[PDB]
Write a protein that holds these residues in place. Structure first.
Motif, PDB file in Angstrom:
ATOM      1  N   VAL A  74       1.250  94.020 117.883  1.00 15.85           N
ATOM      2  CA  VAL A  74       2.360  94.845 118.335  1.00 15.85           C
ATOM      3  C   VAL A  74       3.360  94.862 117.183  1.00 15.85           C
ATOM      4  O   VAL A  74       3.911  93.825 116.800  1.00 15.85           O
ATOM      5  CB  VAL A  74       2.925  94.341 119.675  1.00 15.85           C
ATOM      6  CG1 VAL A  74       1.779  94.246 120.697  1.00 15.85           C
ATOM      7  CG2 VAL A  74       3.568  92.969 119.548  1.00 15.85           C
ATOM      8  N   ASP A  75       3.562  96.043 116.602  1.00  9.08           N
ATOM      9  CA  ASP A  75       4.004  96.153 115.216  1.00  9.08           C
ATOM     10  C   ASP A  75       5.517  96.094 115.058  1.00  9.08           C
ATOM     11  O   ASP A  75       6.253  96.853 115.695  1.00  9.08           O
ATOM     12  CB  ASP A  75       3.472  97.448 114.598  1.00  9.08           C
ATOM     13  CG  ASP A  75       2.075  97.289 114.015  1.00  9.08           C
ATOM     14  OD1 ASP A  75       1.230  96.612 114.639  1.00  9.08           O
ATOM     15  OD2 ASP A  75       1.824  97.844 112.923  1.00  9.08           O
ATOM     16  N   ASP A  76       5.957  95.192 114.185  1.00 14.13           N
ATOM     17  CA  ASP A  76       7.321  95.082 113.683  1.00 14.13           C
ATOM     18  C   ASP A  76       7.279  94.048 112.566  1.00 14.13           C
ATOM     19  O   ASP A  76       6.295  93.320 112.414  1.00 14.13           O
ATOM     20  CB  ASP A  76       8.313  94.679 114.776  1.00 14.13           C
ATOM     21  CG  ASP A  76       9.758  94.889 114.358  1.00 14.13           C
ATOM     22  OD1 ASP A  76      10.333  95.944 114.704  1.00 14.13           O
ATOM     23  OD2 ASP A  76      10.318  94.001 113.681  1.00 14.13           O
ATOM     24  N   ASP A  77       8.360  93.974 111.786  1.00 15.02           N
ATOM     25  CA  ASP A  77       8.430  92.946 110.756  1.00 15.02           C
ATOM     26  C   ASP A  77       9.595  91.986 110.953  1.00 15.02           C
ATOM     27  O   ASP A  77       9.880  91.188 110.051  1.00 15.02           O
ATOM     28  CB  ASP A  77       8.503  93.573 109.356  1.00 15.02           C
ATOM     29  CG  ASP A  77       7.965  92.644 108.276  1.00 15.02           C
ATOM     30  OD1 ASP A  77       6.733  92.436 108.227  1.00 15.02           O
ATOM     31  OD2 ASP A  77       8.769  92.125 107.474  1.00 15.02           O
ATOM     32  N   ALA A  78      10.264  92.019 112.107  1.00 13.65           N
ATOM     33  CA  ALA A  78      11.064  90.866 112.495  1.00 13.65           C
ATOM     34  C   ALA A  78      10.147  89.672 112.684  1.00 13.65           C
ATOM     35  O   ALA A  78      10.479  88.540 112.311  1.00 13.65           O
ATOM     36  CB  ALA A  78      11.857  91.161 113.769  1.00 13.65           C
ATOM     37  N   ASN A  79       8.978  89.922 113.264  1.00 14.87           N
ATOM     38  CA  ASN A  79       7.921  88.932 113.307  1.00 14.87           C
ATOM     39  C   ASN A  79       7.318  88.752 111.922  1.00 14.87           C
ATOM     40  O   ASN A  79       7.019  89.728 111.224  1.00 14.87           O
ATOM     41  CB  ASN A  79       6.835  89.366 114.292  1.00 14.87           C
ATOM     42  CG  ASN A  79       6.829  88.538 115.562  1.00 14.87           C
ATOM     43  OD1 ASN A  79       7.195  87.358 115.554  1.00 14.87           O
ATOM     44  ND2 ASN A  79       6.416  89.153 116.664  1.00 14.87           N
ATOM     45  N   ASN A  80       7.201  87.501 111.507  1.00 12.09           N
ATOM     46  CA  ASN A  80       6.387  87.117 110.367  1.00 12.09           C
ATOM     47  C   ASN A  80       4.903  87.011 110.748  1.00 12.09           C
ATOM     48  O   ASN A  80       4.103  86.422 110.004  1.00 12.09           O
ATOM     49  CB  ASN A  80       6.883  85.780 109.832  1.00 12.09           C
ATOM     50  CG  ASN A  80       6.395  85.500 108.439  1.00 12.09           C
ATOM     51  OD1 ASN A  80       6.397  86.384 107.579  1.00 12.09           O
ATOM     52  ND2 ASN A  80       5.967  84.268 108.203  1.00 12.09           N
TER      53      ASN A  80
END
Length: 96
Positions: free
Chosen positions: A31-37
């Motif tokens: 589930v796509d974002d880059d707050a998540n590493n």
């Protein structure tokens, strides 16, 4: 604390905990974002253990394959037929 009463980490408990961490990162990476590493974490697990995905979460490997998150170099069928990351984590703590 008397030496005879020292606690220790057992192989079954830590393997279980590491598999749960991996499963959480795999889910977050799809589930796509880059707050998540998370995508960096899954890529690192895959490269380090030479695996891609978990047989308990098999459908999620389809997203790993389309985001190029399996070990670099590896082919599509070889992410399918090689052992999964839960098996590799087990082998790490068992010393195989």
């Amino acid at each position: 604390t008397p030496v005879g009463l020292a606690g220790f980490v057992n192989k079954d408990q830590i393997a279980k905990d590491v598999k749960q961490f991996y499963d959480q990162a795999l889910q977050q990476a799809v589930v796509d974002d880059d707050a998540n590493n998370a995508k960096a974490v899954v890529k690192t697990f895959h490269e380090t253990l030479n695996c891609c995905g978990s047989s308990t979460l098999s459908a999620l490997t389809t997203s790993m394959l389309k985001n190029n998150l399996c070990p670099s170099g590896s082919s599509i069928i070889s992410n399918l037929f090689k052992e999964d990351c839960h098996q590799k984590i087990d082998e790490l703590f068992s010393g195989k």
